[PDB]
Amino acid sequence: VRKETYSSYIYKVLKQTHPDTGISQKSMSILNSFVNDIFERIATEASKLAAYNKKSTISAREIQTAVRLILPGELAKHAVSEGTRAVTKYSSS
Amino acid sequence: VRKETYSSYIYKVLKQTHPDTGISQKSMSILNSFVNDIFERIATEASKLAAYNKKSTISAREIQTAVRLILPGELAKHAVSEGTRAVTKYSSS
Amino acid sequence: AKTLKDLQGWEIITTDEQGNIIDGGQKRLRRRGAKTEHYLKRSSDGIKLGRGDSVVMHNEAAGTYSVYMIQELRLNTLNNVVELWALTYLRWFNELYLTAELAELQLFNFIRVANVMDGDFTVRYICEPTGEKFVDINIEDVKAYIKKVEPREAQEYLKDLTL
Amino acid sequence: AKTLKDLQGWEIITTDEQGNIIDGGQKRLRRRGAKTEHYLKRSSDGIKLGRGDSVVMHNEAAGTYSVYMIQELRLNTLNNVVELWALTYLRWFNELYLTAELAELQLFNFIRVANVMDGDFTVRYICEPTGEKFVDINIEDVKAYIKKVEPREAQEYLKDLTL
Amino acid sequence: QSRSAKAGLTFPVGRVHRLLRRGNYAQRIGSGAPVYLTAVLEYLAAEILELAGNAARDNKKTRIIPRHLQLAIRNDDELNKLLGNVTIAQGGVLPNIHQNLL
Amino acid sequence: QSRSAKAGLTFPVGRVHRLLRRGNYAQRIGSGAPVYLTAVLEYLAAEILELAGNAARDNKKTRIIPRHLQLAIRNDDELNKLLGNVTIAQGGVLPNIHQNL
Amino acid sequence: RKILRDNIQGITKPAIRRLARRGGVKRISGLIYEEVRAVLKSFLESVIRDSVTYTEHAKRKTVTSLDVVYALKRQGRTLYGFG
Amino acid sequence: ILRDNIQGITKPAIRRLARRGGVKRISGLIYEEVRAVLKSFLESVIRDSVTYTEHAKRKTVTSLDVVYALKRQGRTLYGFG
Amino acid sequence: KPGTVALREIRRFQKSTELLIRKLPFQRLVREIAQDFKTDLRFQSSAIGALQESVEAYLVSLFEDTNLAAIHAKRVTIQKKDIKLARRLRG
Amino acid sequence: VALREIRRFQKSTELLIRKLPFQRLVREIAQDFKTDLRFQSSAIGALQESVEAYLVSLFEDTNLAAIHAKRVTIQKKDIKLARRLRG
DNA sequence: TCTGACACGTGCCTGGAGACTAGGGAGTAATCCCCTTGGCGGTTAAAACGCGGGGGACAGCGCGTACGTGCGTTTAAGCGGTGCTAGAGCTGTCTACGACCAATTGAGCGGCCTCGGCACCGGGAT
DNA sequence: CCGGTGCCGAGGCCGCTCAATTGGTCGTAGACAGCTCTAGCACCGCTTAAACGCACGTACGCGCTGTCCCCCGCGTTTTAACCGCCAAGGGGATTACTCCCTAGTCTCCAGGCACGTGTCAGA
């Protein structure tokens, strides 16, 4: 009871490209801890990066700079290209 | 201007055991960054340690557990023995 | 462009292969080998800004125009809303010399495009801001290596073509 | 002791060398080689609780007393206000067998001290809870290695003295 | 509709915002930061899921076992540079040999 | 009379408490936590300063140079394990040689 | 209260052999099985002690999978699939 | 403009660093490999420092920014902040 | 032929993903190591397998680098000096 | 002559790598990330004291990699393994 | 024998300390099960031991080639001293954006069927 | 791998507490704006340590061989690892309430920061 995992969202984002591929519960917990560790890494990097500028808030630029810090190479470029597209489709409404 | 360091306290704790030994300003900045790195290490350990038990109050138990997690060997064994001996004199007054 | 207030005159065109397609948000997947390309055309006239194009822009302090040869463009960086690394040109203070110096162009300077080749402008030789090493090579030989290969080797390619 | 409510009957005696001194808060410095020792005596009668002493305490479920041979004591750990790793003894269910099993004793159980040696109690042989390997060695031979050497080697020393 | 439906994503914006507020990262939290974070980790989960699906389709299997996730992470260069200090449960090892052995 | 004097230490308890409050490490902070961190910071600084003074006395110098601090750190065992991923500026390297050279 | 007298010998020699065949080792010397078990003891003496301090911070008496995965997360040996 | 500046650090400088490391003899083919190691190392550190500076809307990489970038990479430098 | 079924065992254990280290001796080892830290300390059964997976992935990463150090030293067998180097090259 | 140079460069704490070549090197590397980007005068010295520490920590381990293989002169394959084993 | 940076009184001002309030989070007691541990049979899959051998490990050697070292020789590195100027770090407004307080509600976390792709066999070529 | 049961485990289906969402409202930290001054860049020059070569012996890298011995591998014994199953028990949850302890806000003041001139290292 009251375990906020990432099971159904990962299962939904799997089936939107490869709908004929199942996923085990152990691999589901692996991906849950995977996105939880990436969330903890980006959140701690944004916390330290907002502390380094004497700021009190975390905007989208803070998380964008922290995720360009953490992820290496072209994957970070594709990640920020996805994130900026999503926030421009979100906020412009 | 109005940038707080630990310079005078390091100088005072040096001048009560080795009173005839000076200290350079470069080594002063080295020791200041050293104790600042240890401070942020213990703080970021106690933050994630209090997050693991769903608490919101960092106490002497949290910092004592984080500093026996960070410092290796008998150095932590002398460190917690000094810390408890100091906080008993503090809270006993 | 600098920010989203200046990014209201361009859109993200994400060509997957050498053909011109979009296929959603950058193929919806990160795919190696098939290196994606992005040239952003304005909706007023459709002027392409691609990897190897020569754009014209007035300088921030001079006022006299200058040509920038685009080496790379990175979508949605931190300070800028899109970054653009472009190779500079040498002004005669109409023949324009080539320069392998990278710089960054903002959207409030770019006016028109001009494919500067040898005989609206005329290239003579690759040069340097030091003032020597004139190598009479046009821009048609390096644009294929720019478009085909990532610029981590094309930088050393046009650095070795000089000197 | 468990907490500070039960730690009001002992004080920290920090002997630097083999002699009995205090010299402030653990020599005011961390010094290698001269390994510091701590035996905590109660202010009622001055009974020493040292590295190698055999204390008597009633068990938490049995009620019948048991002897604990102190192997190590660590000042101001996390759960307890001071931790005490002591070797257990075998009850006859008056001869007491030795056991190399570590355990932890709390302050609300310890009553008296008793230097159990061979012929208030009598040791016969080191044994095990399995019920065999009786090695007729008294406690006087191992207390010097306990007091002189850190227990990381004394654990393997009395483990190799058995079996 | 929720903020995830307004963003065009399938990952929870409000759960990430609640975890950011309860994780003691800052006193204040901007508006674009949780939707940016959900977009980033949604793209990361989608990429690791499609690479695991490619590893499963290269083994003629459908259910993604953790061995498929290990062989999908370690075969990619930038994911292995990202997950350099990782340990995956039931992953085994890469199929790898050196030329100075055979 | 102050908080650091009531603790009996030479390091600021109030600055540690203010930096713990402003550093986003928790929502609430107990009383014993900043004085415990003050005590352990004072102990660590006192130990590293005693070892640096030992290096300065063994090198016939009256001021702590960074070479004295690096020799004091790398000559110790547990301080080197605590500061393994630590590079000190203007200090060079610990003097050691291999037997097979 | 089990008399586990040097159970580091419980990791037997064909177990280290199988681990080396997984790692890609053709043949192993005979003076390695005494060393690899000491390396394993030195590694577990760090990570198990970190997990014990983690689980006795929370006034508990069970070492759960969250405790060992957090102790491995702090040591730069981040395990997945448990929390 | 700036090109082949990795040959500015020369093989006697690598000889000095190797004598500080404690070698006796080194090869003549290790210099390009040491330059290739240093290139990737300074590339990662300079890229992280540039990211830290470009976050703060600055146009000058500070010593505090580069010591934060070295702290994040597990190579915590002292004496600068 | 000698030395060809070792490559067969390598190909068997590289395609597989099972647990090479046994469960109960590793459990007894973890218990006797934590015996010096807390008496009567029970372990969750998921945590023992978690420690086993971390030990396995650490030991095969040590053994791969050890075999690489032996290969660089113009040998195909490993020695104690290789693992001593790999521990002094990884802290 | 050799071990005298080891004893000289192992006791003194001078700047081994030169200042202005290191300046031009970090400027050439940073020019691919931000053009017209300035550097603090303490930041380049911090980069030098970190780079010459990492290189010495690499060299004092590839010397162990050389003497492990019963040889004195190091090779490119020594430092390749010395970086590849931990980085 | 020389001098050139490091350390004791110096006004202050602004951050630390005391006091007086509530509110809210931990800390005592309290169920009750949801996980362990443990000891039983069992049976068998690796583990242990012994020998053969043969192929790699170590050691000596001899041809030799790349490398430390010695001595010109450029030559670019280090210090200084300019000028200048780009931007870091301030103060000041205010403003736009987030925290916090109720209301609501779909949603996304738990039970519950309902099938369905992987296992490992005969045995067949891998 | 054909393919057959089967199985046990994920996939839809239902479904109901509850935290995500909306709406005002206040309040408060960042965004512009100036400034200013400060630390960093360029450049010329002046010495000047030192990188850059050529020889040159020479000493270790490296290929060959030769011995030898130690571990790979197989065959027999053996023994405890895995399974499982029941049973006991104990500690990890989750109320609960309360209480005391710490955030907030004044409140007073003092302490520790920036100069600074007297004093102490190096060559």
Side-chain angles (χ1 to χ4, degrees), chain A residues 1-2 5-24 26-93, chain B residues 1-2 4-24 26-73 75-93, chain C residues 1 4 6 9-10 12-34 36-56 58-59 61-68 70 72-74 76-82 84-100 102-106 108-114 116 118-124 126-129 131 133-135 137-139 141-144 146-147 149-152 154 157-158 162-163, chain D residues 1 4 6 9-10 12-34 36-56 58-59 61-68 70 72-74 76-82 84-100 102-106 108-114 116 118-124 126-129 131 133-135 137-139 141-144 146-147 149-152 154 157-158 162-163, chain E residues 1-59 61-84 86-102, chain F residues 1-98 100-101, chain G residues 3-83, chain H residues 1-2 4-81, chain I residues 2-39 41-91, chain J residues 1-4 6-87:
Chain A
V1 193
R2 197 62 258 169
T5 80
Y6 282 73
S7 85
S8 69
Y9 314 102
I10 281 175
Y11 186 68
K12 187 194 268 199
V13 76
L14 161 69
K15 291 312 195 59
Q16 55 99 19
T17 46
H18 303 149
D20 46 350
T21 67
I23 172 160
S24 160
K26 190 73 82 178
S27 50
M28 184 50 84
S29 173
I30 280 178
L31 293 174
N32 185 30
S33 188
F34 166 78
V35 300
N36 273 321
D37 183 73
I38 292 176
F39 160 70
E40 180 150 348
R41 278 187 196 185
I42 298 173
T44 43
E45 201 53 55
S47 177
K48 269 188 225 160
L49 188 59
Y52 286 162
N53 284 9
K54 310 172 199 61
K55 299 294 190 291
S56 184
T57 190
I58 301 175
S59 67
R61 210 187 63 215
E62 266 72 27
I63 284 182
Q64 176 170 25
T65 43
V67 77
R68 274 227 182 198
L69 261 178
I70 288 180
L71 321 185
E74 194 76 26
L75 195 140
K77 164 171 171 275
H78 282 228
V80 300
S81 170
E82 168 86 29
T84 47
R85 152 195 283 104
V87 301
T88 44
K89 277 213 63 174
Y90 165 71
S91 45
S92 67
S93 180
Chain B
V1 188
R2 275 88 172 260
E4 44 184 12
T5 71
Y6 284 2
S7 85
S8 55
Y9 314 102
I10 279 167
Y11 181 75
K12 197 204 272 219
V13 79
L14 173 58
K15 285 310 190 62
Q16 51 203 21
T17 53
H18 281 223
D20 46 349
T21 71
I23 178 168
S24 161
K26 187 70 81 192
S27 45
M28 185 53 84
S29 172
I30 280 169
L31 290 177
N32 165 69
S33 185
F34 163 78
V35 300
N36 258 332
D37 167 70
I38 290 181
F39 158 70
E40 64 192 348
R41 206 178 286 195
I42 297 170
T44 47
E45 200 50 57
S47 159
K48 288 191 284 184
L49 198 43
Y52 289 160
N53 302 344
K54 273 88 67 177
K55 320 285 188 72
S56 310
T57 305
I58 287 179
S59 72
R61 181 163 184 86
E62 273 87 9
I63 283 183
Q64 178 174 7
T65 45
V67 78
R68 263 178 75 98
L69 273 164
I70 284 166
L71 317 184
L75 190 138
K77 190 241 188 181
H78 283 221
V80 298
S81 308
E82 178 148 343
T84 55
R85 202 167 313 189
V87 301
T88 42
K89 189 144 164 65
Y90 173 70
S91 171
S92 62
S93 43
Chain C
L4 279 167
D6 308 349
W10 277 275
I12 311 176
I13 298 106
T14 312
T15 65
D16 311 339
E17 299 97 9
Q18 212 160 357
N20 303 283
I21 41 179
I22 293 95
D23 279 342
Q26 211 171 14
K27 313 169 289 298
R28 313 291 284 113
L29 314 170
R30 187 183 68 88
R31 293 285 95 207
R32 277 89 59 197
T36 176
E37 210 267 326
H38 314 88
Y39 64 99
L40 319 179
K41 45 172 94 159
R42 29 174 178 179
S43 301
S44 89
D45 46 357
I47 285 300
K48 325 192 299 176
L49 276 77
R51 214 165 76 200
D53 299 1
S54 308
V55 292
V56 187
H58 63 274
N59 289 317
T64 307
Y65 283 82
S66 291
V67 185
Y68 287 138
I70 321 292
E72 197 270 333
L73 57 95
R74 188 138 75 251
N76 287 109
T77 60
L78 321 168
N79 207 349
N80 322 316
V81 73
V82 53
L84 177 136
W85 304 113
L87 305 162
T88 60
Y89 270 59
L90 274 189
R91 187 48 55 166
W92 60 75
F93 52 85
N94 307 320
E95 263 183 359
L96 284 151
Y97 321 101
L98 284 171
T99 314
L102 279 76
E104 187 145 2
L105 183 54
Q106 300 221 8
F108 80 108
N109 305 117
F110 158 70
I111 298 287
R112 79 201 65 91
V113 77
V116 181
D118 52 328
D120 294 331
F121 306 100
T122 296
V123 75
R124 197 191 157 183
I126 323 170
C127 187
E128 276 91 6
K133 271 88 70 176
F134 288 89
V135 191
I137 303 184
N138 55 321
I139 73 160
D141 279 328
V142 298
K143 59 178 210 290
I146 281 162
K147 289 172 186 177
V149 199
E150 296 155 351
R152 52 103 179 173
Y157 166 66
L158 92 161
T162 49
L163 269 300
Chain D
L4 279 167
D6 308 349
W10 277 275
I12 311 176
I13 298 106
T14 312
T15 65
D16 311 339
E17 299 98 9
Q18 212 160 357
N20 303 283
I21 41 179
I22 293 95
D23 279 342
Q26 211 171 14
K27 314 169 289 298
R28 313 291 284 113
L29 314 170
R30 187 183 68 89
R31 293 285 95 207
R32 277 89 59 197
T36 176
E37 210 267 326
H38 314 88
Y39 64 99
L40 319 179
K41 45 172 94 159
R42 29 174 178 179
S43 301
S44 89
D45 46 357
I47 285 300
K48 325 192 299 176
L49 276 77
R51 214 165 76 200
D53 299 1
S54 308
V55 292
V56 187
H58 63 274
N59 289 317
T64 307
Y65 283 82
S66 291
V67 185
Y68 287 138
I70 321 292
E72 197 270 333
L73 57 95
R74 188 138 75 251
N76 287 109
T77 60
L78 321 168
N79 207 349
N80 322 316
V81 73
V82 53
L84 177 136
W85 304 113
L87 305 162
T88 60
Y89 270 59
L90 274 189
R91 187 48 55 166
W92 60 75
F93 52 85
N94 307 320
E95 263 184 359
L96 284 151
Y97 321 101
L98 284 171
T99 315
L102 279 76
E104 187 145 2
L105 183 54
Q106 300 221 8
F108 80 108
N109 305 117
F110 158 70
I111 298 287
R112 79 201 66 91
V113 78
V116 181
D118 52 328
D120 294 330
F121 306 100
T122 296
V123 75
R124 197 191 157 183
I126 323 170
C127 187
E128 276 91 6
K133 270 88 70 176
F134 288 89
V135 191
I137 303 184
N138 55 321
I139 73 160
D141 279 328
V142 298
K143 59 178 210 290
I146 281 162
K147 289 172 186 177
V149 199
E150 296 155 352
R152 53 103 179 173
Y157 166 66
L158 92 161
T162 49
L163 269 300
Chain E
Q1 84 283 340
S2 75
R3 304 192 265 173
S4 45
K6 203 194 293 181
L9 302 166
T10 80
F11 273 27
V13 170
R15 187 189 322 273
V16 156
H17 194 107
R18 168 180 65 93
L19 269 178
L20 278 185
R21 284 193 289 110
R22 296 292 175 88
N24 301 328
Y25 306 117
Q27 313 153 356
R28 221 176 272 188
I29 281 156
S31 81
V35 289
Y36 207 96
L37 188 44
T38 53
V40 167
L41 63 94
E42 181 259 339
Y43 160 70
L44 272 153
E47 191 177 2
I48 195 183
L49 266 167
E50 64 92 18
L51 274 181
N54 292 4
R57 274 193 311 274
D58 288 15
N59 211 4
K61 314 197 81 142
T62 73
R63 266 82 167 266
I64 298 180
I65 69 188
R67 176 63 180 206
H68 286 143
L69 264 170
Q70 179 84 256
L71 293 182
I73 283 174
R74 304 305 188 178
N75 276 181
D76 204 2
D77 177 72
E78 304 211 331
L79 286 172
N80 196 31
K81 203 184 297 179
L82 206 156
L83 279 78
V86 79
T87 290
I88 304 166
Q90 203 184 6
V93 82
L94 264 169
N96 191 272
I97 212 66
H98 313 98
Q99 42 198 356
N100 296 350
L101 285 148
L102 279 76
Chain F
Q1 194 53 255
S2 71
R3 201 176 179 173
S4 166
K6 216 194 290 179
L9 316 173
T10 74
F11 269 47
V13 181
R15 197 189 324 271
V16 161
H17 189 276
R18 187 246 291 182
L19 263 178
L20 277 169
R21 272 201 285 105
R22 275 177 172 169
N24 294 124
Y25 308 122
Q27 204 149 7
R28 323 184 73 226
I29 292 168
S31 79
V35 57
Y36 209 98
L37 200 145
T38 291
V40 73
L41 265 189
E42 182 214 4
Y43 163 69
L44 278 161
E47 188 173 2
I48 195 179
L49 267 168
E50 179 63 58
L51 283 180
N54 286 0
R57 284 182 314 170
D58 294 338
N59 214 354
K60 307 286 288 295
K61 291 178 184 292
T62 79
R63 269 206 303 142
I64 306 298
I65 73 184
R67 172 60 161 208
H68 294 344
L69 266 170
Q70 180 167 356
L71 288 198
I73 282 178
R74 307 307 177 177
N75 272 315
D76 207 354
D77 294 334
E78 313 185 36
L79 271 184
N80 197 27
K81 264 299 171 283
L82 183 60
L83 280 77
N85 46 353
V86 163
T87 68
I88 304 166
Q90 314 284 126
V93 74
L94 180 74
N96 57 336
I97 212 164
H98 309 272
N100 296 271
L101 190 146
Chain G
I3 39 173
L4 312 169
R5 310 291 184 180
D6 201 73
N7 289 27
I8 190 53
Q9 302 309 124
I11 318 292
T12 76
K13 175 182 61 63
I16 286 97
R17 282 183 69 250
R18 286 182 301 201
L19 287 151
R21 296 288 168 83
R22 177 171 284 179
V25 181
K26 184 177 290 293
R27 46 183 294 160
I28 309 163
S29 159
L31 273 300
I32 280 173
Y33 311 110
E34 197 39 67
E35 201 269 345
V36 165
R37 66 189 76 242
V39 173
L40 177 53
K41 185 171 189 309
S42 77
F43 167 73
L44 281 181
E45 201 179 319
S46 69
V47 64
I48 293 175
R49 181 170 37 88
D50 285 5
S51 77
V52 167
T53 45
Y54 263 118
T55 192
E56 84 178 3
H57 158 77
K59 313 219 208 191
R60 264 205 294 269
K61 273 206 181 67
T62 81
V63 183
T64 191
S65 62
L66 294 160
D67 299 326
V68 288
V69 77
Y70 290 153
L72 285 151
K73 186 191 157 21
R74 200 194 57 85
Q75 277 188 169
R77 272 77 172 263
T78 65
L79 174 52
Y80 273 7
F82 294 97
Chain H
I1 309 178
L2 261 64
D4 300 311
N5 308 84
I6 202 165
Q7 275 79 18
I9 164 171
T10 67
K11 25 168 189 175
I14 313 181
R15 272 173 204 267
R16 267 194 297 272
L17 294 151
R19 290 330 206 273
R20 178 165 262 185
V23 312
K24 181 161 197 314
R25 296 167 30 92
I26 54 172
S27 160
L29 271 80
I30 67 160
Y31 302 133
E32 286 297 318
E33 195 262 3
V34 161
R35 280 156 208 151
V37 168
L38 171 135
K39 185 70 151 205
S40 84
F41 178 73
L42 272 165
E43 172 168 338
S44 77
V45 170
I46 278 298
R47 181 140 46 86
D48 286 5
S49 87
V50 158
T51 309
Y52 265 109
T53 302
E54 202 185 354
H55 162 80
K57 297 309 171 228
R58 293 172 190 154
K59 290 172 184 290
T60 302
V61 170
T62 64
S63 48
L64 203 66
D65 283 358
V66 77
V67 80
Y68 288 154
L70 285 159
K71 176 189 168 287
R72 204 201 53 86
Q73 289 205 30
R75 273 175 295 263
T76 304
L77 179 66
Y78 277 176
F80 302 101
Chain I
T4 177
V5 311
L7 263 175
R8 204 189 55 189
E9 188 174 358
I10 283 174
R11 288 189 300 272
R12 184 177 81 209
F13 284 139
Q14 268 192 352
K15 288 182 192 174
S16 176
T17 173
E18 64 181 2
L19 305 183
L20 313 175
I21 312 150
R22 304 299 110 202
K23 312 205 166 187
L24 273 76
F26 184 81
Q27 155 189 34
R28 288 194 264 118
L29 165 66
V30 163
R31 209 156 278 142
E32 68 94 20
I33 283 182
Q35 203 172 349
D36 306 330
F37 306 130
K38 185 57 187 292
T39 317
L41 184 67
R42 54 184 70 250
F43 296 100
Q44 189 143 334
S45 81
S46 170
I48 286 180
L51 259 183
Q52 182 190 6
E53 186 70 35
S54 62
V55 156
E56 197 151 340
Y58 170 60
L59 260 185
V60 301
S61 180
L62 172 66
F63 278 159
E64 178 171 354
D65 299 332
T66 298
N67 212 52
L68 195 41
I71 276 163
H72 149 74
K74 302 308 213 196
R75 288 185 309 273
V76 301
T77 198
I78 40 167
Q79 287 101 17
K80 185 174 90 97
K81 210 152 54 191
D82 303 73
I83 323 174
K84 189 186 289 187
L85 178 132
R87 278 212 65 86
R88 223 177 279 140
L89 262 291
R90 279 174 74 253
Chain J
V1 190
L3 51 96
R4 190 197 332 263
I6 279 96
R7 210 162 288 108
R8 184 177 195 276
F9 295 127
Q10 202 177 11
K11 211 81 177 306
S12 168
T13 68
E14 86 270 16
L15 294 184
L16 263 65
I17 321 179
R18 310 291 103 215
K19 308 195 69 166
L20 274 185
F22 204 86
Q23 277 206 13
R24 293 189 321 273
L25 189 43
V26 301
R27 255 185 268 264
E28 192 210 7
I29 288 182
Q31 87 193 27
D32 310 335
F33 308 126
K34 179 151 281 294
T35 322
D36 209 10
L37 173 66
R38 326 186 84 83
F39 269 113
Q40 197 146 328
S41 191
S42 164
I44 300 181
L47 276 149
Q48 178 192 16
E49 285 281 345
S50 199
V51 158
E52 88 172 5
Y54 169 64
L55 283 178
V56 162
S57 182
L58 172 64
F59 281 160
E60 81 169 354
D61 295 340
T62 193
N63 201 39
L64 188 49
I67 70 167
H68 167 69
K70 303 188 273 265
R71 31 176 297 180
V72 184
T73 305
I74 79 172
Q75 200 177 6
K76 164 208 183 213
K77 302 162 82 175
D78 277 284
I79 310 168
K80 267 166 74 172
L81 185 139
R83 186 181 193 259
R84 204 250 175 264
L85 206 146
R86 73 197 188 179

